[PDB]
Structure 1
Amino acid sequence: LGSTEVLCLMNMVLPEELLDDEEYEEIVEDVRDECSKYGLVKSIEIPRPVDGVEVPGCGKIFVEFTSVFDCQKAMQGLTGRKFANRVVVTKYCDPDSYHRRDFW
């Protein structure tokens, strides 16, 4: 898919790391601050485990930019780098699916 204005970042988080509100907030800001180097970030979605179940999209990080070009630059600037020693893998998301907030 793509290019589009929504970026999906994979291989960065363990569900365990998303249970504590303090640690969850730290990860979101970490993502925002780095993605903001490339564009204005309109939204960030990081699905969290609920009732001890990995909900659709848990494990993934979604970031929406104001333009396709800004999303493209962020994909180039972030893909293949390390986040908590893990190689970052990326794909474009369908803004429609993101507009529905349907993750998988």
Structure 2
Amino acid sequence: GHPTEVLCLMNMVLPEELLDDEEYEEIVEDVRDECSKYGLVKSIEIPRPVDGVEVPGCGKIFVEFTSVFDCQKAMQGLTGRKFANRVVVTKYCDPDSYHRRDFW
């Protein structure tokens, strides 16, 4: 719809996974190596509910990109896909609220 700078990816994770040490770190790795396949990624932020401390909303990860170009080509392949068995909703996020960390 419109490229900004940051790329958001939700409906692809669950608190039942972002609650373990190796499990949570697992997604962080795959998600990082994946986003860094179309271009360069500044960083990534993933929720980590402490024994269910941040479950409320948990399940939404985002990635800080460097160039909107590789960002476009990024979701152009990981959109509507399946991180495991569910569709992944990708929505271009703005560096504004992103840094605001309105999520976690």
Per-residue deviation, 1:51: 5.2
Q: State the aligned residue count.
A: 101
Instruction: State the TM-score, normalized to the length of structure 1.
Output: 0.86
The aligned runs of 1:6-21 (5 Å cut-off) are: 6-21=6-21
Q: Secondary structure at the match of 1:96?
A: helix
Counterparts of 1:25 and 1:51, CA distance in 2: 15
The worse-fitting range, judged by mean Cα deviation, of 69-78 and 52-61 is 52-61
The answer as to whether partners of 2:9 and 2:91 remain within 8 angstroms in 1 is: yes
Runs of 4+ in 1 over 6 A off after TM superposition: none
- Give structure 2 stretches of 5+ with no counterpart: none
Pairwise CA RMSD? 1.7
The answer as to whether partners of 2:8 and 2:90 remain within 8 angstroms in 1 is: yes
- Give structure 1 stretches of 5+ with no counterpart: none
The answer as to whether partners of 1:12 and 1:59 remain within 8 angstroms in 2 is: yes
Q: CA separation of 1:56/1:38 partners in 2, compared to 1, >3 Å: closer, same or farther?
A: farther
Q: CA separation of 1:38/1:58 partners in 2, compared to 1, >3 Å: closer, same or farther?
A: same
Percent identity, aligned pairs only, is 100
Counterparts of 2:42 and 2:26, CA distance in 1: 18
Instruction: State the TM-score, normalized to the length of structure 2.
Output: 0.86
Q: Secondary structure at the match of 1:16?
A: coil
Q: Secondary structure at the match of 2:31?
A: helix
**What do the CA deviations read for 1:57-80 (whole angstroms, capped 9, x no partner)?**
521010111111121111112101
